[PDB]
Scaffold this motif. Structure first.
Motif, mmCIF file in Angstrom:
data_model
loop_
_atom_site.group_PDB
_atom_site.id
_atom_site.type_symbol
_atom_site.label_atom_id
_atom_site.label_comp_id
_atom_site.label_asym_id
_atom_site.label_seq_id
_atom_site.Cartn_x
_atom_site.Cartn_y
_atom_site.Cartn_z
ATOM 1 N N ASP A 40 -43.369 -99.974 -17.151
ATOM 2 C CA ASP A 40 -44.075 -101.241 -17.273
ATOM 3 C C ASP A 40 -45.156 -101.298 -16.207
ATOM 4 N N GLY A 41 -46.132 -102.175 -16.423
ATOM 5 C CA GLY A 41 -47.238 -102.308 -15.496
ATOM 6 C C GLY A 41 -48.392 -101.382 -15.819
ATOM 7 N N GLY A 43 -49.086 -100.257 -18.648
ATOM 8 C CA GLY A 43 -49.691 -100.695 -19.894
ATOM 9 C C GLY A 43 -50.847 -101.652 -19.675
ATOM 10 N N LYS A 44 -50.725 -102.534 -18.681
ATOM 11 C CA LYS A 44 -51.822 -103.442 -18.359
ATOM 12 C C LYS A 44 -53.051 -102.674 -17.885
ATOM 13 N N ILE A 47 -54.584 -100.945 -20.988
ATOM 14 C CA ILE A 47 -55.287 -101.849 -21.892
ATOM 15 C C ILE A 47 -56.567 -102.372 -21.249
#
Lengths: 48, 48
Positions: A40-41, A43-44, A47
């Motif tokens: 996680d993380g 992905g930000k 994007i």
């Protein structure tokens, strides 16, 4: 004599290439870590 | 406008996704499942 020329040689392969496979098995253990770890993380960042 | 909205929604949903990941890990850890079992057993005793 010819038989000797293979017997020990066979053991070499029995102790060499198969051995590498065991190392690859350890890599699979690392893959199991991905089961116990949720990414996680990142992905930000991707994007963005 | 669409890119900004999508990026904002993704950041908003990252937190919920991580919360769901934590809930899934907690459930897989077998930590809080017997409370419902005890409640339903009490209900069964009352119904009996």
């Amino acid at each position: 004599d010819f038989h000797s020329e293979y017997i020990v040689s066979a053991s070499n392969f029995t102790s060499q290439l198969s051995s590498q496979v065991e190392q690859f098995l350890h890599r699979n253990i690392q893959e199991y870590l991905s089961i116990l770890t949720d990414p996680d993380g990142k992905g930000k960042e991707k994007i963005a | 406008k669409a890119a900004s909205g999508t990026t904002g929604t993704y950041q908003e949903w990252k937190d919920k996704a991580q919360n769901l990941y934590q809930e899934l890990l907690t459930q897989e850890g077998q930590a809080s499942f017997q409370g419902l079992k005890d409640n339903v057993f009490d209900g069964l005793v009352r119904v009996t």
